[PDB]
Design a protein around this ligand. Sequence first.
Ligand SMILES: O=c1ccn([C@H]2C[C@H](O)[C@@H](COP(=O)(O)OP(=O)(O)OP(=O)(O)O)O2)c(=O)[nH]1
Ligand SMILES: O=c1ccn([C@H]2C[C@H](O)[C@@H](COP(=O)(O)OP(=O)(O)OP(=O)(O)O)O2)c(=O)[nH]1
Ligand SMILES: O=c1ccn([C@H]2C[C@H](O)[C@@H](COP(=O)(O)OP(=O)(O)OP(=O)(O)O)O2)c(=O)[nH]1
Lengths: 175, 175, 175, 180, 180, 180
Amino acid sequence: MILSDKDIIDYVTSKRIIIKPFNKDFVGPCSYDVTLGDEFIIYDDEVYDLSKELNYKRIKIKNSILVCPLNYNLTEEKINYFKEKYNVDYVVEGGVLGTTNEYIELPNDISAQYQGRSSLGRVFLTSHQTAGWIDAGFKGKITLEIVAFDKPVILYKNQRIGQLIFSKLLSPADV
Amino acid sequence: MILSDKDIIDYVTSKRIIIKPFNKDFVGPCSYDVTLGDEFIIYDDEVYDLSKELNYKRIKIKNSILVCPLNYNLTEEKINYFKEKYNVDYVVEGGVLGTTNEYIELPNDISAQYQGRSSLGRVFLTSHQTAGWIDAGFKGKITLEIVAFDKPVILYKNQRIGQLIFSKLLSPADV
Amino acid sequence: MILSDKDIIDYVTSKRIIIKPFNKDFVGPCSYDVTLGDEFIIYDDEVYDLSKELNYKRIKIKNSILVCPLNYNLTEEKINYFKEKYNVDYVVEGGVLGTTNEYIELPNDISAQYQGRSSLGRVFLTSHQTAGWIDAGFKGKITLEIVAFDKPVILYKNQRIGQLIFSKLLSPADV
Amino acid sequence: MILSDKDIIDYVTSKRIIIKPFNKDFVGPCSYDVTLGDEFIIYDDEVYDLSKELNYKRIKIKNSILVCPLNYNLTEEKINYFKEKYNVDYVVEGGVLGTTNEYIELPNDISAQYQGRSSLGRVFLTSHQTAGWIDAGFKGKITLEIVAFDKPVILYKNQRIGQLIFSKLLSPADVGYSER
Amino acid sequence: MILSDKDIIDYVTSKRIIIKPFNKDFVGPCSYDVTLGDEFIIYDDEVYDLSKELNYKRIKIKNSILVCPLNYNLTEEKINYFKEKYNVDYVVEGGVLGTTNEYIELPNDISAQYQGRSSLGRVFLTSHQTAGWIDAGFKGKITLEIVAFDKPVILYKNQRIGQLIFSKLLSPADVGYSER
Amino acid sequence: MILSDKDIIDYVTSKRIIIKPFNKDFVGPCSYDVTLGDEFIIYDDEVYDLSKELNYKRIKIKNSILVCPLNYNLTEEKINYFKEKYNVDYVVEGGVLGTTNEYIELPNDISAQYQGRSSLGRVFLTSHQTAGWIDAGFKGKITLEIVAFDKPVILYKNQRIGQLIFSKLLSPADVGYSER
Ligand SMILES: O=c1ccn([C@H]2C[C@H](O)[C@@H](COP(=O)(O)OP(=O)(O)OP(=O)(O)O)O2)c(=O)[nH]1
Ligand SMILES: O=c1ccn([C@H]2C[C@H](O)[C@@H](COP(=O)(O)OP(=O)(O)OP(=O)(O)O)O2)c(=O)[nH]1
Ligand SMILES: O=c1ccn([C@H]2C[C@H](O)[C@@H](COP(=O)(O)OP(=O)(O)OP(=O)(O)O)O2)c(=O)[nH]1
């Protein structure tokens, strides 16, 4: 059972579902729009070995970022070209980790799924690689996996980036 | 609660869920198979800036299309080579927008999720970049985001391309 | 209605949902962790034409495999370099098919969705290209579509690779 | 969850739930109205011992019946009085068995509950004395147990007597047997 | 599915379900307690014929009432005896209509069921003789049908008389009409 | 949604729902049958005032009991007649309290409803006069309120007396308290 706008509003009001910050204007028919944070993470190791601690660089943008498909072959000149042409603060190619501004807390009877925005999906920009289901009892902001699959895409700080679809559990969970 | 074949058939019959055109043979255990339209859209701008109107080219194929992974480096010769070898009408690399033939209308108590076909997923061809959830109250055809991630894939006009999974909402939505 | 840990445990116990092999420690708040098999499949044809029988190579690893993004341009030297540096048994670029060790059987009142692990999604490694919904009545192991979208990723035999989210159907299905 | 009018219509249309005869105008917001049959049964035993087949009489009214509360003491004189004053075909006191005209069939994923109508409950007339839940897989008409608890009540043949509330089961049920 | 205390609170808060007056402490694990109004109705007819508007009397108690089982035979002598011995404002026998103080409004996706409280059922006192399901979209107070089946029972004004069990509908229901 | 036989079995197996003693063959399509205990309670007061602890008598039958409708007027002569003619250990009239042999425990996500069995409702014998919904979190046996509305009915010790219908709650309920 997917929660409708009426249920989302009720759950947030009674604090069954925490969403900080919260804007009722982001409540859709059966989902809640979340926004893009200004902080990103770029890994700087040769390969991903989950058995080891990953090295990364923390990037914070002022207004926007240009996300290019992997192997876009970004040179010094190309980057400067893009910055001056599209007024982007940072230009990256390949994968980049972002985060929603919204911090959430889910009760033991609710599971949530994050999905990237439809308007961005139509331009081949995804903010999540997996289905996006989040365990009941979860607490924290939503980590985003941003990848462009066709051409560079401009993303803006605080812009709606996706939505959270809330689903009822058949029974309460033990976590 | 995901609708089973029995529920899909009931909802279509009473017009709670609209699906045009409709073929009962496309009704699966708990989903409905949709088909690929012959019309596609290819963007022709340098970058995607959602703050601006996007420029694109409308392509219509007769029978099939060959979708190549991005940066496949398609030259004049390669294209002609593929057309003559696989009898495809059009050859594209990177992202391409398509559409289901089926036009749908969802009631205020039903949310639907589109997912690309399993047989195509096994050959690394996706027709959707996001989770695919569609708001209750939605009306229209389903836009497809087609991308090949391993090797070129042939797609045929009117072939089953994915499925719609229908879910009940906990309460009716206000849209 | 998504099944919680309590429901998963009940359904497995009464054999409504089959999972072989089964480890109660893999039961999460509202999902079940599955593991990666040691057998993989690599297609060796020029293009994917679903109207024809696909040619492939069956690969079996001893401990681990390095999955590189497509067009990573793997040469003899690079491969040997990666094997000696990361102790991987096999190095592949682009798409590779894998499988969960777990064999499942779903009843007529349950639909399941497979999603790749969150820790792997954070390093841009996906084990499924589609939403991952599986029909009620389904029997068999879960086929995995593995693709790396940022940098090479090491995968280990028998490691948790994703999770199965179980959902109740509104009515029993006819298959 | 309880089936709304839209769900009842769908289930009848696809024959998931059988209702014979079916009247689309009997479908309410979240129930289906059923009507009173013209055949009633009156037991004829000193005490009721379920180990035995109870003795009874089968009567069939032409149009109406007057149900009096237990111990109303209906003498031939009183009976003729009521029949003439209210034009009722039959006069009874105490418990009387009736039936719905409607024959139903429930699937393995639906359970139904019968409830006597509120308008009759308002005059202390009941057509059931238990919750009235019906097992999924049930096939048949609904047996009614009619009792008046205050004053005699007039009931008419084919009148709406109660409603069926349909609820979904959490999972398909084993109806007790299977055929192949 | 039945709404738990958390669901009842949410629905009242957003006014999806109206309850007036509302007492947060009347919310139980999976129901809402309702209370007995001070106005009762007693019918005054030989028999009940629904084709007519039944004659009745409207009484209003100051604090309490003694409900005696039907055929208790209440003579002026007995009535004064009870009123003096138990200090009840009114003494009645048989069926009597009452009402809840609470006024409710149900949305198109909720159906409610009224049930008399267990503590009173334990002394064979009932405030309803049918299942008591209420249609989604209903607006109004709850009519009560009070009957004692063993010995006279004392009821007090404003006491908790029963509970409302709220259940979700499978789909939104057509409440019977619409306004634009 | 109502739990089907498969759900009842799962919940008992994992102890989410406690039922003692448990008989797997008492699991029906969408309910669980419960049985009649051998201990009954009969009140002994002129009127019932809930502000007080009512006086009662505790009887224990060896095998069976005859429940007669209220005002049946059971004299020593009549009582010995029934006991000898039907071999019943006890003869009572009016309301009598009984209990199920079964002890149950409900979790915070389940609500159960008790209903007297249809076969007994068919002879106008009821073991409950209210809807019978039980709060999630409830722990204990089921109290029964037995009343015959037509003729005396014979009940036997340990016989199936009714059923429990289990329904899922929309959300987990606060059972009223917590312990740490
Ligand atoms: O490939 C697609 C993309 C979108 N849609 C549908 C589903 C969704 O409900 C709607 C989204 O339309 P739009 O991009 O105008 O809205 P939005 O991105 O949800 O706006 P916002 O994030 O401000 O709520 O169109 C599809 O069916 N297929
Ligand atoms: O990675 C995968 C792909 C498929 N499946 C399962 C789920 C699905 O229910 C079934 C699909 O099998 P197949 O490709 O033969 O069917 P189809 O694409 O649904 O045929 P159609 O579109 O004509 O209905 O196999 C998995 O578990 N994992
Ligand atoms: O992009 C992401 C990734 C994860 N999560 C949340 C959802 C999920 O429930 C949790 C997963 O955290 P972690 O990677 O530590 O756990 P795991 O991969 O589920 O461990 P395991 O597979 O051993 O159960 O964090 C998000 O919200 N967004």
